[PDB]
Amino acid sequence: VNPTVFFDIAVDGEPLGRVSFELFADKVPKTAENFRALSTGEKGFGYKGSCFHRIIPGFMCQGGDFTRHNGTGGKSIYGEKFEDENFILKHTGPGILSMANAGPNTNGSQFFICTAKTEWLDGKHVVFGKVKEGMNIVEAMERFGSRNGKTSKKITIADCGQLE
């Protein structure tokens, strides 16, 4: 019953591969629905064509800024920012999908895929999904990151949508 969304990743325009996510609509419905709708683009805006602007190997891949492409923009389907829904789910290892924010109740559209256990984020960032297929593609994305987060090539969501 939980939706599945996919990202087809590209590296400097070359296809890399496909990652799919399960979204925990059963536990964080508002958060999950924001990510789902931005992945289908059904509201007229969303993730298609946007980049992963910050990749720190051994920590996380961050993306979702589809308005300024650098970590300063983005927006939710509900408006500029919406509340922390709940902190039921924790950052328990690689493949966790969690919201980026700039303080309490400042979720927009930026998210990150964890590539490590990041338990110090528990209770501060809403966990809402997990990689289902293509963790190996996330691992490949990590090789284009750097210690300060700048990537050596442009990582883009070439296509994205809902699989079920």
Question: Resolution of the experimental model in angstroms, please?
Answer: 1.7
By residue count, the chain amounts to: 164
User: Rounded CA gap, 66 and 47, in Å?
Assistant: 6
Catalytic residue, from 62, 89, 91, 97: name it.
62
User: Rounded CA gap, 125 and 93, in Å?
Assistant: 14
Tokens 């691992």 correspond to what residue? 139
Token pair listed for 114:
């964890």
Catalytic residue, from 54, 66, 107, 110: name it.
54
Domains of the chain: 1-164 (2.40.100.10)
Where are the alpha helices (H) located in 22-154, listed in sequence order?
Answer: 29-40, 135-142
Active site residue 62: yes
Active site residue 91: no
User: Rounded CA gap, 94 and 123, in Å?
Assistant: 18
Residue 65 φ then ψ, to 5°:
-85, 90
- Which of 109, 144, 147, 141 is closest to 128 using CA atoms? 109
CB 111 within 8 A of CB 7: no
Please indicate the experimental technique that yielded this structure. X-ray
Residues 6+ apart with CB under 8 A from 103: none
Helix (H) or strand (E) holding 158: strand 155-162
User: Rounded CA gap, 18 and 32, in Å?
Assistant: 20
User: Cβ of 144: how many Cβ atoms within 10 Å?
Assistant: 19
Residues 6+ apart with CB under 8 A from 14: none
